[PDB]
């Protein structure tokens, strides 16, 4: 039996979980009451006859983001003790999720993780789902992962944090939270894929033609990407991909595990049957620089490895012909020490549609996670907004005064300097 | 007499071989339920080459199935001609070889080894004899390349006199999946030169090229990939199963096709391979089978033999053809283009004639030729290995799972001895 | 059992040769799906010459279709008697090479001759002597004259003593379509004089003139202009396929019509040709068939033989005849017209009686005549070539595809040489 555990935490935690678990229940024939009117084994359990209970560990510090699913349409879906919320949030403060309030909620969150992993037949992965420039997603994510690396320090840990954007922004403490939480994302994360919120914005504007996507429309696109990532773990397939196959084949040198992601086609109903969705065309839209779901324009980087997943009615002869055109395209270039490598899986089940959503019914899909060295330019803009706020010690007394000692800022700065550095002479 | 046991390994090994047991069972006339409907004695006179007998008259394939991941075990069992296999021949893991060569050879595939040698032993020891062991695997992956050749080494220890017919899928030159193609390929051809025998060559871009030009499949399938290999299965093992005029068992193939012990890489090919449009317009005679089988657009390897020289070659004719009509065609093809045959071995070709044609066709021929041109493939495996290894790529899996970079650099050093050895033999 | 490899090139050559394969299929009883229909042994024994033998049973033609535009071969395939052809001998190309001899000979057609010549080899070494390469192509387009010149050159260097006939159509003076036609002829004659044994010169004005003043057709078309060419080509190779009193094959035609090797541009003809009332009103005596060969009206050249001297003349008679009137009809035309015949050859004549007439008619003649009067063809092509080349009209799409201007000056130097040795030979 294949299984995996999802570790939604934060507002970007729970709300992405609401989009991904409505998707995973509809594609499996699982109703919100819980039961079905053999692919279920990786996202649901079998308590009794029917009632496929999900295997999320939905977690926050404040109750006002977990209470609407404790009283919502999916109330009788989750185990109610997998929905874990305290009384007061970390309030955009790493020290308020990592040193102060949070110890008395980690001991319950990893308590619930223990007796999910007990009823597992060989564990495969830990899908962590968090925000990174925020509060509970950064601090409580870092505590939960630093002590996930000791009691299950052998399984893969696939993080999907949402990085702060260069131009778009939401709070003044993005540099003061995401820069120092790369400690969690480097020495305790095995694959980290950043889904920047700015990129999900304009990818709805161009392709979906919605000028005005809300957070709910963003989370459905991410839910599609997870549904195509851990897809071979569910359905019958062609050339297959596991989480260990994803691990060993995309990833170069061990600290280098910061990757992009891209979906294709992300077309809407009008732009659906006016063009043929051939395998060659959908992988060109997968590779095109405006489709990366982080603003990381890959022409100013160095592609190292790409892992593509062709969900649906995709023929591998069309796949090999299509990726050959990617080699011949001089815009998309690759590093010299990785001369080959376009690791591609093909699932059979077509991508499912969310009723009331904005995506059209497409026979095919391409999900690409690639490791271009332009991902260091995320940290190049991010460090620029760190150093000049830290130059006169702005916002430092809310951190050194709560639970933390001064000095973590300087060595996390050294960590980002070495993170940009390790992406330089690898691509030289 | 002449027991050959399939040792199916890897994802690719189990659908290549599931079609092997789909075409061999068609030629010997066995339903998926296990009964026979062909009404002929000559069909049922060498069943023991591939089918052990079981109570109630039902045959079973002598076929150990082997994986680390049970998904492709489910696909073989569920498909047609799939519920003929013995259920404890289904020796599978629950973890999955993640395309890591260390993952098959030095960790978890190695704890399933004591179970897979047990089922190999049970279907090999109790008999009168066995001619050899047949093995299909998937060099470039995790399972067929990984513990797959660990089962090759241990069978070589247990029976170091029986022949190892290995149908291996080398990596594609043009493009393929699985970024760690070079790391699996060289480390596996390290031991496929010394615990080995005929290591014949099959490639995915190569076989694609037959089903675009030679067969004009507009939408080819992986099933069509396995069917062309499965046709070559019956050709290479035909005189062990059906009588002829000049019989040639599978060991007789090796002795007149290997000049020096490490020179054991063989292009495979099938003829006739005719498209439906050209089905009724062309004819079927020995000059046309010879022109098609030496044609490099037909060879199942992507190495082009015109950029080389045939050391020694062999052919498997099957039909009601004249043994004369074969042997001046061998003489004529040797005399016209003598530039592609070596001078230091005279008369570079063996011919075998089986009386019984393959299923359907009136006549067919299978080419097993030791051309020296295969260093097109081997230098392609080498020059991508030099790129990844020189800059230490992906090695934190291969050394962190229990090896060192000594084994990589001497797999490269064995590898360059192989391209050198073919070079002066040309 | 001598063979002819028939290669049709160009849009014009494909249409002319498709009319050839239906006037030789009804002459041999071949159905559109290849099956003999009657019960005559004389119609079938020499089927090896223009047809092969399939294990299906059908007599596929030994034809190689050859045209860079995949629209004309679609028309040949979908038309009647187009199901006979092998689909492998349909070498396509998808670029067009539109009305450019530079594109046909140096640009795009260069990477197509390496595939059409494989088809030529698959048809040619399938025997022990080939008789000739009957090639039909145009000299006014790009695919016809260009890649036609490629195929005539590489066939000759591979096969030095094999014949190759060339029923090529030359550009037309009075009204013609392609503007660069003098460029497409001057650059093609230069290789058509050094790599060719026989070039039967055909125009378009005199073929229109035949169906205007022998047939009185108010409605001709390109099909019936081709049916006259196909009837002429049938009678020339008639002794290779049918028995006769005095058999004379294609090589007999060559050795007895060329004084010296460059002077090999003949004139073709066919001379039973009746009008509407004049089918019942025309006698079928040998002297009248001799009368209709030696008329400027029934010449397929519009290069009037009265304005010139017959170097040598031959007539391939067909039908149930008297072997004496076949010769003194040649003797009387040489005596009553003695100034129209070269003095340094007594007996400028050959008669050759085959015994199988065309269907329906009682006799037939095909006149092949080496004349001085092909001077007029080359001198007006030189007049159209020099008028544009002196101001370099349209030159930069022949230099642009890759040439130099000396290739044009040498092409005119060979063809202004071609009018010269015909001039002291008069």
């Amino acid at each position: 039996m294949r299984e995996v555990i999802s570790i939604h935490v934060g507002q970007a935690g729970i709300q992405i979980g609401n989009a991904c678990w409505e998707l995973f229940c509809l594609e499996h024939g699982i109703q919100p009451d819980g039961q079905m009117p053999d692919a279920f084994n990786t996202f649901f359990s079998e308590t009794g006859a029917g009632k496929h209970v999900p295997r999320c560990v939905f977690l926050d510090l404040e109750p006002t983001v977990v209470d609407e699913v404790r009283t919502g349409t999916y109330r009788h879906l989750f185990h109610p003790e997998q929905l874990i919320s305290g009384k007061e949030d970390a309030a955009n403060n790493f020290a308020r999720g990592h040193y102060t309030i949070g110890k008395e909620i980690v001991d319950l969150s990893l308590d619930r993780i223990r007796k999910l992993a007990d009823n597992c037949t060989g564990l495969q992965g830990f899908l962590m789902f968090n925000a990174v420039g925020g509060g509970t997603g950064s601090g409580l994510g870092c505590l939960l992962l630093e002590r996930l690396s000791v009691d299950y320090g052998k399984k893969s840990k696939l993080n999907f944090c949402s990085w702060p954007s260069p131009q778009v922004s939401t709070a003044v403490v993005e540099p003061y939270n995401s820069v120092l939480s790369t400690h969690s994302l480097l020495e305790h994360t095995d694959v980290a894929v950043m889904l920047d919120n700015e990129a999900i914005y304009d990818i709805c504007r161009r392709n979906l033609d919605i000028e005005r996507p809300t957070y709910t429309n963003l989370n459905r696109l991410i839910a599609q990407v997870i549904s195509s990532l851990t897809a071979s773990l569910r359905f019958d397939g062609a050339l297959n991909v596991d989480v260990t196959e994803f691990q060993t084949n995309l990833v170069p040198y061990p600290r280098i595990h910061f990757m992009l992601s891209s979906y294709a086609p992300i077309i809407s109903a009008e732009k659906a049957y006016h063009e043929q969705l051939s395998v060659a065309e959908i992988t060109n839209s997968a590779f095109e620089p405006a489709s990366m779901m982080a603003k990381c324009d890959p022409r100013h980087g160095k592609y190292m490895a790409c892992c593509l997943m062709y969900r649906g009615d995709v023929v591998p002869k069309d796949v090999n012909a299509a990726v050959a055109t990617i080699k011949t395209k001089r815009t998309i270039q690759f590093v010299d020490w990785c001369p080959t490598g376009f690791k591609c899986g093909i699932n059979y089940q077509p991508p499912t549609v969310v009723p009331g959503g904005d995506l059209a019914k497409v026979m095919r899909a391409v999900c690409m996670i690639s490791n271009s060295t332009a991902i260091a330019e995320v940290f190049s803009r991010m460090d620029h907004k760190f150093d000049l706020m830290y130059a006169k010690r702005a916002f430092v007394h809310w951190y050194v005064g709560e639970g933390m000692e001064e000095g973590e800022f300087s060595e996390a700065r050294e960590d980002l300097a070495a993170l940009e550095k390790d992406y330089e002479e690898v691509g030289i | 007499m002449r027991e050959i046991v399939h040792v199916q390994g890897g994802q690719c090994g189990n659908q290549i071989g599931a079609k092997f047991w789909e075409v061999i069972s068609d030629e010997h006339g066995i339903d998926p339920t296990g009964t026979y409907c062909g009404d002929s004695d000559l069909q049922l006179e060498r069943i023991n080459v591939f089918y052990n007998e079981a109570t109630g008259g039902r045959f079973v394939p002598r076929a150990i199935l082997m994986d680390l991941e049970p998904g492709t075990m489910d696909s073989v069992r569920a498909g047609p001609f799939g519920q003929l296999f013995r259920p404890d021949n289904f020796v599978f893991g629950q973890t999955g070889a993640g395309n890591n060569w260390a993952k098959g050879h030095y960790t978890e595939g190695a704890e399933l080894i004591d179970s897979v040698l047990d089922v190999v032993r049970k279907e090999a020891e109790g008999c009168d004899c066995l001619q050899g062991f047949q093995i299909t695997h998937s060099l470039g992956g995790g399972t067929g390349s990984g513990m797959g050749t660990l089962l090759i080494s241990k069978v070589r220890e247990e029976y170091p006199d029986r022949i190892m017919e290995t149908f291996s899928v080398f990596p594609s030159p043009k493009v393929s999946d699985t970024v760690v193609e070079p790391y699996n390929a060289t480390l596996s051809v390290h031991q496929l030169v010394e615990n080995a025998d005929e290591v014949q060559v099959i490639d995915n871009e190569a076989l694609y090229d037959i089903c675009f030009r030679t067969l004009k499949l507009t939408t080819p399938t992986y099933g069509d990939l396995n069917h062309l290999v499965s046709a070559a299965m019956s050709g290479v093992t035909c005189c062990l199963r059906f009588p002829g005029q000049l019989n040639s068992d599978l060991r007789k193939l090796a002795v007149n096709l290997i000049p020096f012990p490490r020179l054991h890489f063989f292009l495979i090919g099938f003829a006739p391979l005719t498209s439906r449009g050209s089905q009724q317009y062309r004819a079927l005679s020995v000059p046309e089978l010879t022109q098609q089988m030496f044609d490099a657009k037909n060879m199942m390897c992507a190495s082009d033999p015109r950029h080389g020289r045939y050391l020694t070659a062999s052919a498997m004719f099957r039909g009601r053809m004249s043994t004369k009509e074969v042997d001046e065609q061998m003489l004529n093809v040797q005399n016209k283009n003598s530039s592609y045959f070596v001078e230091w071995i005279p008369n570079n070709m063996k011919s075998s004639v089986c009386d019984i044609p393959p299923k359907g066709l009136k006549m067919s021929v299978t080419f097993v030729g030791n051309s020296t041109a295969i260093q097109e493939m081997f230098k392609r495996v080498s020059d991508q290995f030099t790129a990844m290894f020189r800059r230490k790529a992906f090695l934190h899996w291969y050394t962190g799972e229990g090896m060192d970079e000594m084994e990589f650099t001497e797999a490269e050093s064995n590898m360059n001895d192989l391209v050198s050895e073919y070079q002066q033999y040309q | 059992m001598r063979e002819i490899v028939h290669v049709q090139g160009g849009q014009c050559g494909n249409q002319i040769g498709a009319k050839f394969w239906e006037v030789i299929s009804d002459e041999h009883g071949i159905d559109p799906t290849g099956t003999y229909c009657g019960d005559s042994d004389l119609q079938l024994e020499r089927i090896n010459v223009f047809y092969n033998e399939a294990t299906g049973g059908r007599f596929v033609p030994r034809a190689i279709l050859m045209d860079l535009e995949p629209g004309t071969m679609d028309s040949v395939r979908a038309g009647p008697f187009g199901q006979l052809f092998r689909p492998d001998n349909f070498v396509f190309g998808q670029t067009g090479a539109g009305n450019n001899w530079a594109k046909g000979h140096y640009t795009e057609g260069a990477e197509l001759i390496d595939s059409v010549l494989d088809v030529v080899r698959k048809e040619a070494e399938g025997c022990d002597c080939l008789q000739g390469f009957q090639i039909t192509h145009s000299l006014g387009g790009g695919t016809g004259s260009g890649m036609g010149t490629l195929l005539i050159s590489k066939v000759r260097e591979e096969y030095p003593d094999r014949i190759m006939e060339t029923f090529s159509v030359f550009p037309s003076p009075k009204v013609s379509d392609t503007v660069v036609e003098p460029y497409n002829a001057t650059l093609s004659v230069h290789q058509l004089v050094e790599n060719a044994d026989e070039v039967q010169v055909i125009d378009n004005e005199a073929l229109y003139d035949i169906c205007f003043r022998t047939l009185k057709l108010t409605t001709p078309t390109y099909g019936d202009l081709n049916h006259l060419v196909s009837a002429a080509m049938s009678g020339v190779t008639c002794c290779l396929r049918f028995p006769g009193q005095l058999n004379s094959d294609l090589r007999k035609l060559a050795v007895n019509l060329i004084p010296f090797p460059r002077l090999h541009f003949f004139l073709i003809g066919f001379a039973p040709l009746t009008s509407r009332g004049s089918q019942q009103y025309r006698a079928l005596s040998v002297p009248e068939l001799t009368q209709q060969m030696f008329d400027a009206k029934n010449m397929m050249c519009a290069s009037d033989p009265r304005h010139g001297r017959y170097l040598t003349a031959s007539a391939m008679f067909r039908g149930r005849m008297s072997t004496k009137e076949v010769d003194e009809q040649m003797l009387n035309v040489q005596n009553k017209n003695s100034s129209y015949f070269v003095e340094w050859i007594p007996n400028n004549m050959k008669s050759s009686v085959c015994d199988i007439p065309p269907k329906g008619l009682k006799m037939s003649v095909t006149f092949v005549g080496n004349s001085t009067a092909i001077q007029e063809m080359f001198k007006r092509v030189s007049d159209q070539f020099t008028a544009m080349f002196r101001r370099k009209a349209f030159l930069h799409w022949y230099t642009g595809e890759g040439m130099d201007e000396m290739e044009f000056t040498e092409a005119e130097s060979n063809m202004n040489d071609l009018v010269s040795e015909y001039q002291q030979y008069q």
Binding site: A238 | T219, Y222, G223, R276, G360 | S75, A78, G223
Partner: peptide, 24 residues
């Protein structure tokens, strides 16, 4: 869902089952 390994070629490979005008 065995739709990848379609039998587009039977036991003999011979692949499985599946404008011009007039100048008369």
């Amino acid at each position: 869902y065995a739709l990848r390994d379609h039998l587009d070629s039977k036991l003999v490979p011979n692949q499985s089952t599946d404008h011009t005008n007039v100048l008369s």
